Design a protein around this nucleic acid. Structure first.
Lengths: 165, 432
RNA sequence: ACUGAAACUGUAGUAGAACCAAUCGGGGUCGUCAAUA
RNA sequence: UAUUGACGACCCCGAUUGGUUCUACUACAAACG
């Protein structure tokens, strides 16, 4: 790895983000391609024709996650989840998920957890010393958004195979 | 030489995301699959004009002076969605530095002295800007019933909030030009289909859109088709382009976040709206501008309210809006009609029929048009074309009667005659 | 029993055309609750 | 056999579409009197 003071450290860091971003994206595709991995990460599942929760409830969450630009915005998503949880009829909309409301709470509030789900080995993808710690602190919110977007797309397109018969 | 130019978004405003939907022409509702989003650079954002010209002739070309005039006029459009709201740029602070690379002193000036400054105003005086034929329509509307495009997602204190955009250092309420163009296109197509008695129920949404005159005015998707050996693009850009509309009413980017992040309608929302409307001490005056409206669905056997079906709208009941600005590239139409200025009259006639409906409240705009919102009052339409063909010049009019009776009757009859001739045989008018 | 020299992978080309963030919903209203003596 | 004796609010958004279609290199300079 480059010495931290090295003059090409700035340029190298542009190469790193690119390699990390595209790695996160490709892994999010793979993880979203299986229904067991979608249920593990968000609790989202198919029950015959039915989606747990309905796609409208996933769209509501996904519309709030668009506001997760940084970890200073995780209060926005935790605001949404507490409001959802505080309304009994909306909470019940998420029963028969595999604990999906708390899985969302965790992913938004445990910074390591997106990386645990992605489980990318970033060593082939970093060259700056302290590259992994800084890029994880930098790309966290984008990784969360990227994984949930992929999961919800793979969910809906597996739902279409069960629903459109 | 044209360099890559980085865009400086004002302050550090983030990129906006703009929602898009195709509305099925039969059901009047979002067509399946036709739901999309586009990241857009705000407005007010700046970037360099990175241009270098190597002259072999003496002086600077007239065509290149004309180009720089068009940039300062704001006539060039850049990027995607040029007809659907986007892409307008304007040049400011144009500077010309000249280096006589043909001579010792000018080559060293290139190396060391940063060049001779030319007064642009001198060349700008030597030239007349040859603006191409276009018609510009500017419509002055005030909302009759609240008008608003829905924001991309449900709020906390208010479920349904107006769409906003960054306009410099402030946020303003926006009616995307994508929205004004889809309502105008929808009424344009409905008129055409009504005359031809042509149904839209069996066609898919891409087929529903593809009908005559609107394909030239509003544009058609690129779609290469083998006709017979020959291969033809059915796509053409719209000659009609609409610009996003913005309110008279602006807020600082945090004032609106105070509204978006309010959690109690009678709690912290009240200060947020009092702040954002500019009436911090008059909730009454504040709520004559932005009014929260509660709505229920009432269950049909019990009355009361249906479980869960309680929702709220921030109705911009008293937001004032800027004029809508439409731009008809007469030159682009004339190219589609292979130069034949006589073929313009049906497209012009259609556009004036669409404007007659817009003025007569037949075209509501934005969210909730069937549900208490979206009715506009059109108090003036200003048709203001430049280099129009001589028979279309009576378009140059400020209209205030909704029924077009400010346009000369002999002109409206001439358009009506060509319109009726087309109705009698509604050929694809750009096929030759 | 003698290193060839010299030579810009460059030139032209708008990631664009089409697409409504939209459809439905009265801020509404009556008898329940507890089980014995 | 039918008595005991009055209190009390609820709903807080729900359902859906989440991209669709087209263009995917084209001429060149090296080939060929």
């Amino acid at each position: 790895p480059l010495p931290t003071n090295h003059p090409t450290q700035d340029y190298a860091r542009l190469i790193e983000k690119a390699a990390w971003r595209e790695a996160i994206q490709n892994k999010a595709l793979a993880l979203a391609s299986s229904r067991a991995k979608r249920e593990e990460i968000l609790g989202i599942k198919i029950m015959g024709k039915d989606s747990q929760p309905t796609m409208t409830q996933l769209g509501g969450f996904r519309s709030v996650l668009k506001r997760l630009h940084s970890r200073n915005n995780r209060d926005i998503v935790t605001g949404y989840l507490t409001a959802l949880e505080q309304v009994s009829n909306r909470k019940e909309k998420w029963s028969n998920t595999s604990q999906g409301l708390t899985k969302i709470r965790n992913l938004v509030t445990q910074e390591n957890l997106i990386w645990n789900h992605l489980d990318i080995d970033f060593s082939p993808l970093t060259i700056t010393q302290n590259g992994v710690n800084q890029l994880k602190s930098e790309l966290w919110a984008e990784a969360v958004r990227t994984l949930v977007d992929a999961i919800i797309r793979g969910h809906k397109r597996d739902l279409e195979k069960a629903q459109e018969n | 030489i044209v360099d890559d130019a980085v865009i400086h978004i004002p302050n550090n405003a983030d990129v906006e995301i703009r929602e898009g939907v195709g509305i099925d022409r039969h059901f009047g509702t979002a067509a399946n699959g036709f739901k999309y989003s586009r990241a857009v650079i705000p407005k007010g954002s700046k970037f360099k004009l990175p241009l270098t010209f190597d002259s072999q002739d003496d002086g600077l070309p007239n065509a290149l002076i004309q180009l720089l005039c068009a940039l300062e006029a704001g006539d060039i459009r850049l990027g995607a969605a040029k007809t659907r709201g986007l892409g307008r740029i304007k040049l400011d602070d144009l500077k010309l530095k000249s280096f006589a690379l043909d001579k010792p002193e000018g080559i060293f000036s290139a190396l060391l002295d940063q060049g001779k400054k030319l007064d642009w105003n001198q060349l700008k005086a030597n030239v007349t800007y040859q603006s191409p034929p276009y018609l510009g329509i500017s419509i002055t509307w005030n909302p009759k019933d609240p008008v608003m495009v829905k924001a991309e997602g449900d709020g906390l204190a208010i479920d349904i909030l107006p769409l906003v955009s960054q306009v410099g250092s402030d946020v303003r309420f926006v009616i995307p030009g994508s929205s004004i163009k889809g309502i105008l296109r929808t009424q344009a197509e409905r008129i055409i289909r009504t005359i031809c008695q042509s149904n839209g129920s069996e066609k898919n949404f891409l087929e529903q859109l593809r009908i005559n005159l609107v394909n030239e005015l509003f544009g058609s998707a690129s779609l290469s088709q083998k006709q017979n050996g020959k291969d033809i693009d059915l796509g053409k850009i719209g000659a009609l382009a609409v610009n996003d509309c913005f309110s008279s009413l602006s807020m600082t980017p945090d004032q609106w976040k105070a509204v978006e992040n309010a959690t109690e309608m009678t709690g912290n929302l009240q200060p947020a709206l009092k702040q954002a409307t500019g009436y911090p001490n008059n909730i009454s005056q504040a709520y004559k501008v932005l009014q929260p409206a509660m709505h229920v669905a009432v269950d049909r056997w019990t009355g009361g309210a249906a479980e869960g079906m309680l929702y709220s709208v921030l109705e911009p009941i008293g937001v004032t809006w800027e004029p809508i600005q439409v731009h008809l590239d007469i030159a682009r139409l004339k190219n589609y009609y292979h130069g034949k200025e006589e073929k313009l009259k049906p497209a012009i006639a259609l556009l004036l029929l669409v404007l007659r409906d817009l003025a007569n409240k037949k075209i509501p705009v934005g969210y909730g048009t069937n549900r208490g919102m979206g009715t506009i009052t059109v108090s003036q339409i200003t048709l203001n074309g430049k280099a129009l063909p001589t028979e279309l010049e009576p378009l140059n009019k400020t209209m205030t009667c909704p029924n077009l009776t400010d346009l000369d009757e002999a002109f409206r009859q001439d358009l009506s005659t060509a319109w009726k001739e087309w109705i009698a045989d509604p050929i694809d008018l750009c096929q030759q």
